[PDB]
Write a protein that binds this ligand. Structure first.
Ligand code: JH4
Length: 282
């Protein structure tokens, strides 16, 4: 079926939970043996969210190459994304090592450091120009260059230096700051505006390594971001935009990381975002 009218048909019939459970039943199951090794317990935020072995990002280290991060490679859309958990106190250096080694231009952050009164990720970037951060375990230096605070999101320019070679690179930090503590946003308008700002920066384009996107677990809000981007791109590429099937695209993405889209409300919100976004594109 088309999307907008499949949408109204699920609303009128109140069957979002049943649609979402079908997705959960059909989703791929692949091994995640490296994630579950005992030496990696303090590298995982949640025991039930792990990268598959076949698609995990490897650190360029011989001691321990493990990080909770996955490469989502979308062949028809010609887009790639790295989806990862919010960094932990003992993985902030690994996180920036990955950004460096994978040649990413941008980092997309969809959560606040504290939500619901609890810490959802480490304070992994500097808040003042004159107070830079050094990660001694991976030999990197990170400096805040500029910051632009808007009503729904903040953009930061950061400098990442590989202290071993003295090479430097400019990284863009795109921080969506207004996702509610409970539920999903009422309108997709600010989320779409944010996606378009990431696109306009070049961070999603083939001349760079994959964008790094995270929330707390790296599967819920993060899944919504890449699912909406890929669906909208396919609607631009194909002769028949109504052929784009958001449930099929989501199942394709779940071949590369488990659990993408965590609730039926996130699924409904993804439909809403793609539907509204397709009208603005034209
Ligand atoms: C489908 N995306 C795309 N196509 C051509 C060039 C770049 N991106």
């Amino acid at each position: 079926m088309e999307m907008e009218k499949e949408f109204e048909q699920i609303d009128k019939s109140g069957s979002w939970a049943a649609i979402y459970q079908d997705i959960r039943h059909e989703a791929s199951d692949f091994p995640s043996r490296v994630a579950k090794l005992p030496k990696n317990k303090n590298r995982n935020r949640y025991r039930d969210v792990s990268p598959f072995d076949h698609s995990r990002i490897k650190l360029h280290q011989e001691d321990n190459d493990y990080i909770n991060a996955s490469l989502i490679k979308m062949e028809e859309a010609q887009r790639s994304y790295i989806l990862t958990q919010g960094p932990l106190p003992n993985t902030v250096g690994h996180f920036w090592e990955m950004v460096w080694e994978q040649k990413s231009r941008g980092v997309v952050m969809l959560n606040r450091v504290m939500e619901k009164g609890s810490l959802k990720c480490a304070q992994y970037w500097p808040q003042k120009e004159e107070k830079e951060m050094i990660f001694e375990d991976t030999n990197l230096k990170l400096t805040l260059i500029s910051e632009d605070i808007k009503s729904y999101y903040t953009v930061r320019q950061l400098e990442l230096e590989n202290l071993t070679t003295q090479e430097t690179r400019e990284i863009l930090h795109f921080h969506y700051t207004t996702w509610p503590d409970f539920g999903v946003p009422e309108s997709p308008a600010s989320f779409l505006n944010f996606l378009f700002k990431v696109r306009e920066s070049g961070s999603l384009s083939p001349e760079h390594g994959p964008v790094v996107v995270h929330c707390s677990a790296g599967i819920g809000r993060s899944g919504t971001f890449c699912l909406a981007d890929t669906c909208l791109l396919l609607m631009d590429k194909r002769k028949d935009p109504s052929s784009v099937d958001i449930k099929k695209v989501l199942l394709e993405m779940r071949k590369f990381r488990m659990g993408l889209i965590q609730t039926a409300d996130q699924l409904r919100f993804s439909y809403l975002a793609v539907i509204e976004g397709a009208k603005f594109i034209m």
